[PDB]
Structures are given as structure tokens and as C-alpha cells.
Ligand binder design. Structure first.
Ligand SMILES: Oc1cccc(O)c1
Ligand SMILES: Oc1cccc(O)c1
Ligand SMILES: Oc1cccc(O)c1
Ligand SMILES: Oc1cccc(O)c1
Ligand SMILES: Oc1cccc(O)c1
Ligand SMILES: Oc1cccc(O)c1
Ligand SMILES: [Cl-]
Ligand SMILES: [Cl-]
Ligand SMILES: [Zn+2]
Ligand SMILES: [Zn+2]
Lengths: 21, 30, 30, 21, 21, 30, 30, 30, 30, 21, 21, 21
């Protein structure tokens, strides 16, 4: 999920926006 | 694993700032 | 608003620690 | 909501747990 | 400055990006 | 003023994510 | 390999308190 | 009540940095 | 890496939340 | 001590409370 | 109290060093 | 660089002061 995607490599803010409701 | 527990703490701070008014949902599993 | 915006920053960090594996939803206003 | 309840007075950890899922 | 513009009112990520290097 | 100083703390943390690899200069009351 | 990224967010917080009203410069590449 | 609460939150982080090795006791009232 | 030092700064924020009004002690060296 | 008990393995809030005054 | 003393006027790092062990 | 200086090992307050204006 978010941890496996963003704790192994740096997520951009572009990438974090897909998790916002 | 403490390493991903600490990473998660930073990720929630980042979600708060990027999501803004929309808020976010935080579910560790996936 | 700033004071509540800064307060909400600290709320999400607290939610993270309290909720653990359950996760949580953060919706400042719906 | 959360902000109005907990940014106006300190919520305890037990009050906070109300928002976990 | 950054303080005047942003401790007075909420600044979005776009406005804060203006202060980047 | 402590309110402005605490607001400053949170700004530098937001500058840190937005600015990324470009970095930034932080000047308080200029 | 997110370790240095997480370390950098704590550095900016430490810089904020050490420098005070001097402010600081933060550049992560060079 | 809440802004003394938020202030204390930042106070503990400064104490962590200045005290280093030494450690510290945190007592809000006394 | 500074892994233990970073862990410690998270621990102190969690102790702050959990202990509330009684405060705590943080002795890094033992 | 605290760093030893909680920096490899996650400590619960329950457990952290042993370090309160 | 550190709270009484540092929550309305800024306590510098080296005033705060006084509360260390 | 700062991360290379201070993310490998812990910088002291003196080393950190190098980066103040
Ligand atoms: O990939 C990440 C991990 C943690 C915080 C963040 O902003 C990005
Ligand atoms: O009511 C609150 C507000 C912010 C953090 C917290 O733990 C409680
Ligand atoms: O207006 C502000 C003040 C502090 C942090 C932030 O992201 C925005
Ligand atoms: O095991 C840990 C380590 C750091 C913070 C925390 O809440 C728990
Ligand atoms: O006077 C203060 C208040 C809060 C944090 C800090 O580092 C100093
Ligand atoms: O070397 C470091 C890294 C992060 C914070 C700090 O105070 C020192
Ligand atoms: Cl605050
Ligand atoms: Cl970390
Ligand atoms: Zn704050
Ligand atoms: Zn961290």
C-alpha cells in the first residue's frame, strides 16, 4: 500500500495526492 | 519493524499538508 | 485558520500513535 | 468534527480513539 | 515576511514553493 | 512571540517537503 | 532508501531551533 | 488550554536536542 | 546512520502524549 | 532502557506508560 | 515551570539547557 | 553537504551552527 510504495522509495507530493479523499 | 513505523509517522504529516481540506484516510495494510 | 491548522497537524500525529494498525480517517470538515 | 472537539479543548487518548477505525 | 504572509493566514503548498531555492 | 515562533517551526517542515532537492533559505523577520 | 530523506526532515527542525532569528540555509545537494 | 499543550509538545523536542546525552525530566506542573 | 537518535526523538513525542500531566523522564544513556 | 526496549521492536502506548513519572 | 517560563516569550536553547539532567 | 555530514553521524550544536545565516 502506501508504506510499501513510499517507505522503500521517496514519494513525490504528486504521488501522495492519490491517497487524499 | 520500527523503521516503517517511523516512516508512517512522516507520511501522515505529508498527507495532512498535501490533502488539505479534503482530509485523507490512513490504512496501513495494502 | 492558522491556530486550528497547526492544531490539526498535532492531531494526526496523535491519531497515528493511538490508532496503530487500525488506521484512521481524517476529515477536517464534511 | 475532530477539529472543533479537539482543537478547542484537549482530547484525551481515549477520546481520540473514537476516530480510529 | 514568510512569517507575515503565512502565520496570519494559511498558505498552500503553491505559495510556499515561492520561497524555495 | 511564541505563537509566531511555533508557526515558524511548522513552516520550515512544509518548506522541506515542497522544495525537495532545491532546498531553501529560511529568514524569519526580514 | 528513504533514510536520508527522513533524517533531513529532523535536520531542518534542529536548524530552526539552533539558528533562531539568524535563520538558515539548507541545501541538500552540494 | 490547547496552546499551552501545543507549546509543551515543542518544548520536549528542544529539550531532546539541547540535552543530548544527558536526558531530562519533563514536568508540566512543578 | 543516526537511527537510534531519530527513534529517540519520536519516543519523546509519544511519551509527551501518553504521560500527559505527570510528564516523564528520558534517559538516553542506559 | 527505553531505546533498547523500543527502537527495533514497536512499543505500544501501554508499554510507553512505564516511562511516565 | 518551563511552561510558565517559555510559553509566552521565546526560551532560547541555552536557557532551556538549564532543564537538562 | 549537510545530509552527508549529519545523516551519517550525529552533528553537535556547533556543527549545526555552521549552517545558520
Ligand atoms: O516517501 C515518503 C516517506 C515519508 C514522508 C514523505 O514525505 C515521503
Ligand atoms: O486535543 C489535542 C490536540 C492536539 C494533540 C492532542 O494530542 C490532543
Ligand atoms: O500557513 C502555514 C503555516 C505553517 C505551516 C504551513 O504548512 C502553512
Ligand atoms: O517503538 C516506538 C518507537 C518510537 C516511537 C514510538 O511511539 C514507538
Ligand atoms: O519558548 C519556546 C517554546 C516552545 C519551544 C521552544 O523551543 C521554545
Ligand atoms: O545529525 C543530526 C541529524 C538530525 C538532527 C540532529 O539534531 C542532528
Ligand atoms: Cl503549534
Ligand atoms: Cl525518522
Ligand atoms: Zn506545533
Ligand atoms: Zn522521524
Amino acid at each position: 500500500g502506501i508504506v510499501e510504495q513510499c517507505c522503500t522509495s521517496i514519494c513525490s507530493l504528486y504521488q501522495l495526492e492519490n491517497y487524499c479523499n | 519493524f520500527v523503521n516503517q513505523y517511523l516512516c508512517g509517522s512522516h507520511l501522515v504529516e505529508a498527507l495532512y499538508l498535501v490533502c488539505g481540506e479534503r482530509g485523507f484516510f490512513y490504512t496501513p495494510k495494502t
